[PDB]
Design a protein around this ligand. Structure first.
Ligand SMILES: [Mg+2]
Ligand SMILES: [Mg+2]
Ligand SMILES: [Mg+2]
Ligand SMILES: [Mg+2]
Lengths: 404, 403, 404, 402
């Protein structure tokens, strides 16, 4: 009917692979030397000597970043970045484009359900879902731009006027000095290093605790590299260090294991979720309430549309949702829900002593928590408030070659 | 400079709807209406003097009320619901403090504040009904400020056509009008013993015969039975192929459905119209002993909380089919992944025709005279309901309640 | 019949709103400065700055108090007070009066079932139930007056000749000095104040423990303001303070959470229930036996009639019932059951250093535990033994205006 | 000030001589269906104890009466089964808690008697003794106040009390106005498949005699087992049995979880041989029993029964006491979850209504038309006046202490 706004339909979709490194959604596709890939970090591949020293050795940076642009009939263009690179772009056009062209971008629920159920035979989790996520984020960016409103004002408004951050990186003293309320450090050694490795892990954490003092919150990220028994023994060995929480101790394939971990350490907090997907995947992390915080990555789990549903489920059980640092995509979300208490900022400086843009030089106006926090005013820009760096346009490689 | 300068909340007004048959109180109707004067099993049917009429025990005691929320730009959002005078009293004495000067787009914040601040005397019931109407008025305002239908603000259209089933005493009329199914009210309660059970069976058999073997028939029990009786009644009606049995138990005993399902695992059961908040509904989804949950949008907490309730249910593929609710439910049903169809509570005294759910309070309520509605029917700002200017005379300012 | 007592039927029911503050069943509708509303207390609304310094700011005193009078055909009048104010009075006459006029006041079971089941479509919990509670209490007051017996002598007699009290307030040293067996203090900060707030909460409790000595029982009231994780961490941090029990740590909507709390702290006592209603609501608090004490408020849960049933269920599991404040309405109950060990007295003095009438100047003879206890003798008066202060009647506002 | 209530001055106990008089339902004259018809029992396993219930001693205890006199001369009393040993316990153990006590302290007196006898009680005989004492206290309370007991425990939740009739002639029950008939299962599991077919034929005959609509219940007197119950119920599915009563031994209520797994659409009941609020909580847990049936004179008394009913009420489980006469009538008419009453046919052939307590009382209200009203119960206390003629049969328990 003519009684309401005539919203523009989706006219076209474009995808690009981001050349080089340090720019885009792939946090780990960075230059050598960056602690994110070249410091001692326990991972699922640490079991093997040749893949223990660096995360790139086994392929953490294999996918790369990609960008999706969705243009409406009125010329408005929404976009978003994420990891997935070439294969992600291949799927965007070969499979998902068919559901988008000519559709009303406000039909986020319909579009998500179609892309998800139509890719169920080869998706449900992983790469395909990351593709859907970036497309969904692009849709939301478009919606905010057409309405001339920040995304957070479209998904519930502001439940808080200030977003407080904790900093993930190898230097918690730097995190404390910059204003972050806490610091999350990466565990250096895996179970296969045996008891010597466990002692080294304990010493690693002891030194950090001594450096920041007895009150500064310290969290430990285990990058899905441990197992139930090792986690239980490690946590026990560190009880005196007062660790705030232990993150992703187990493989995402064994969330059932947290029931065993909680039986042993019911007074200790455990978190996970960055490598889990869909509302069906997360319902499991809330069931039994064995996880104090669930941490999906907005660019991986399915997107903002699905994340809103995941947060609602968690909210019915008062389980907080603290997304795996996803820049503005997570900022607009955290500032809007009743159970999204704070945000993570993954130190992107090579030495982890300073705060730099999460997406590198891809954008020119990314809001950064140099003081350990952001405000609603920092987010008051159309869509997700990210403007592509014209200088980065040259690095944007069209995905066309993949279809030749 | 970069984004829209959204108008804030300037004032809030409330009114009681004079007379009957107008507003959100479904059961505050004129005598003779099947909704209050036909044989219907209820929690009070145990007592003879409260058995023949639902008004006898006070189902119409609260009445309807209306809330208007005006923004600084002059735009006014509104909604109606049941609660009458007591509801209006709470609107101003308690909740107004959270609204004045607030950005109406902060739906999540406003709901959490109103809910948690009234926790000491709320969590369920009347107070939540008040919050519900306020929240609905906020969404109507947001739609009007943006000049968009509410459904376009909460996920868009997951379907272009909304199919309805009809609740009333005449399923053959429902069938003739285009409704996909008909839900009838159970006439006798457990206290009527086996005599009443046989009469209940005959009542249903008669309907099954009238509509044919294929037309879906559902049975509403208005929270009036118990586990043992439900199990026996359902067993006695197995050959009638009832689609589902609704609200068989008191809302205080949802745990009883685990027992009912143990006995009749191949039979569908539903409930929820008298349950509230995301915390209340999580228990109806837990165990998956309910095939459909049916909150009332004007009672459970509002659209904001309903969106959360549906999301939790969606994680378990449990459908959400709101209890009546008119446009407040239409905009919701047309936009979610797990909201398959809609209920239409026959509001004609004999249940043979379709009339506006909210009576003459509004002048343009879209009605499913053919058993369905489409997105086009909902393409109006906000919830698309325009107050009948002639009804203003019936709108009683709540001011007298504070004198 | 001609062989038994001809008991008078109910002739009329009247309701009044109690003008001003500090008088009537609404504990929190008091004058500014009272610790009950102006001290640091963690509440469900403490999440927001503008609502954390004062409990009246968010409306804890919005309802006010009301009084119900039920007159029998012999002229005998029973009455009771509670919180609910204007909306409560509106319901009394518009809905419940129909079940009372002409009824035998001894039919307590019938009248409660009728009022409860007839209001289920908008009740089951909260305000409507508070209304029913006051009407029921007025019925019991009437029954005691007609028979010229104290209510406790009508519901089981005296299971003890003395009722021992613990004192709820900001000054446990005063409770100890006055003869109370223990002191319950209000937790000052909510979870949203983070680790700083937690450290402050711990220091707060440590100070009190230091003040009263190692043996004096200290309980902590959390006014449904915490969550599972925070409760677990706070209790762990206070283990050496030997807290007797932690009260209403969780929202009444999440009693299921105590299973998780008990998994972490199985040797620590937890209580709740003042904001729960009906026998159906309380059956859940007893299931699992995860609560050491249930604490319904007699003026809120449904009334004495329903409370007797709640206590009986708890008694089958030896779970003690210690109602929330309630004055004589609770004294008569506590002195008569097998599983009602002691009583709470909410220090109503602005500084919490002395004991004053729970219902203020509404009555002239409220029995008060100035020595930390009361006796059966103190309760030996007709009905609930409360006599309306003549000077207070002028303060009684007829509810008539609400129907004009 | 308030009423000066009379304290307990003394307590007296009597054994009721002869048979057919008093609270022992089964201490009756030979020929009565209650003891001489085909009835499956826990002792049916043995041929010599198969034909009559008296052979194995169902009538071994006999009846007794307790009188509690207050300082004002008012006397409350009650009867039950327990005979001589019951009377012995009344004076040797429980009297100490009663003399000089305020009779209104029902909660205190019950807890003291129960907990003080815990070392040899908790269930059975000792509890039956406490029950009768408690009932006598309530009779006393009502008489001092000149009010019926039901007006002291919640009032009337119904003005009419409908009864179903327990006995061998359901057609007589139907004819007299009772809403349903409960018949006794004739054969036990030890009679094998032959016995099972005969049980089925027995029930089929009754169903065919009363018609398809008249409710028929089956009493199994704690004589079956899980497997047998499951097979029997399955074989009778077409008979539309209303409910199966006390299929298992009171020692195996956990077995109903297994029975319900097999027959979730069938009603099962039990409880007449269960005691205390602690005993009954188990019958409510899991909600595997559609009705709990304590005997007011055995479970602990009215004080404890009120608590048992309150727990059941929290789960909407109905409480329908086993027989009990006025002790049960006053209770059923006053609670939110006590739908109807049982009347154990006491006529030898089960075709007529006779007083539950025989000629012991002169004014027992009887449901000759299948029901009773509040008016029938409007008498002081439990409304039972001792028959002057019966006074001669009241044997003082004094001889037991010589
Ligand atoms: Mg991580
Ligand atoms: Mg319904
Ligand atoms: Mg408290
Ligand atoms: Mg029996």
């Amino acid at each position: 009917l003519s009684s309401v706004k005539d919203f523009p339909k989706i006219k076209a979709i474009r995808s690009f692979i981001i050349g080089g490194v340090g720019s885009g959604g792939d946090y780990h596709n960075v230059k050598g030397g960056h602690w994110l890939i070249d410091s001692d970090i326990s991972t699922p591949a640490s079991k093997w000597e040749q893949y223990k020293k660096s995360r790139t050795s086994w392929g953490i940076n294999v996918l790369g970043s990609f960008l999706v642009e969705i243009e409406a009939t009125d010329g408005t263009v929404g976009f978003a970045t994420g990891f997935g690179g070439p294969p992600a772009c291949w799927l965007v056009h070969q499979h998902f484009e068919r559901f988008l062209i000519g559709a009303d971008p406000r039909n986020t629920n319909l579009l998500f359900e179609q892309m998800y159920r139509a890719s169920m035979f080869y998706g449900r989790k992983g790469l395909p879902i990351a593709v859907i996520s970036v497309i969904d984020l692009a849709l939301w960016d478009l919606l905010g731009k057409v309405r001339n409103e920040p995304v957070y004002r479209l998904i519930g408004g502001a439940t808080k006027e200030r977003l407080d951050f904790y900093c993930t990186g190898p230097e918690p003293t730097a995190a404390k000095a910059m204003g972050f309320w806490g610091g999350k450090v990466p565990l250096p050694f895996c179970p296969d290093d045996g008891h010597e490795g466990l002692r080294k892990n304990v010493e690693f954490l002891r030194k950090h605790r001594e450096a920041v003092g007895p009150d500064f919150p310290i969290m430990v990220d285990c990058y899905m590299s441990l197992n139930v028994s090792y986690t239980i023994e490690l946590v026990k060995a560190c009880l005196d260090l007062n660790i705030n929480w232990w993150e992703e101790c187990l493989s995402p394939d064994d969330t059932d294991g947290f029931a065993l971990i909680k039986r042993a350490h019911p007074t200790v907090k455990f978190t996970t979720g960055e490598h889990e997907y869909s509302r069906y995947g997360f319902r499991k992390l809330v069931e039994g309430r064995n996880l104090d915080i669930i941490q999906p990555d907005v660019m991986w789990l399915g997107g903002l549309t699905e994340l809103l549903k995941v947060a609602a489920l968690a909210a019915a059980y008062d389980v907080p949702v603290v997304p795996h640092a996803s820049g503005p995509y997570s900022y607009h979300f955290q500032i809007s829900q009743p159970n999204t208490p704070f945000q993570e900022y993954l130190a992107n400086s090579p030495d982890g002593k300073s705060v730099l843009p999460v997406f590198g030089d891809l954008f020119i106006d990314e809001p950064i928590p140099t003081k350990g926090y952001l405000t609603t005013a920092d987010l008051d820009k159309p869509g997700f408030g990210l403007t592509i760096n014209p200088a980065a346009r040259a690095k944007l490689i069209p995905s066309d070659y993949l279809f030749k």
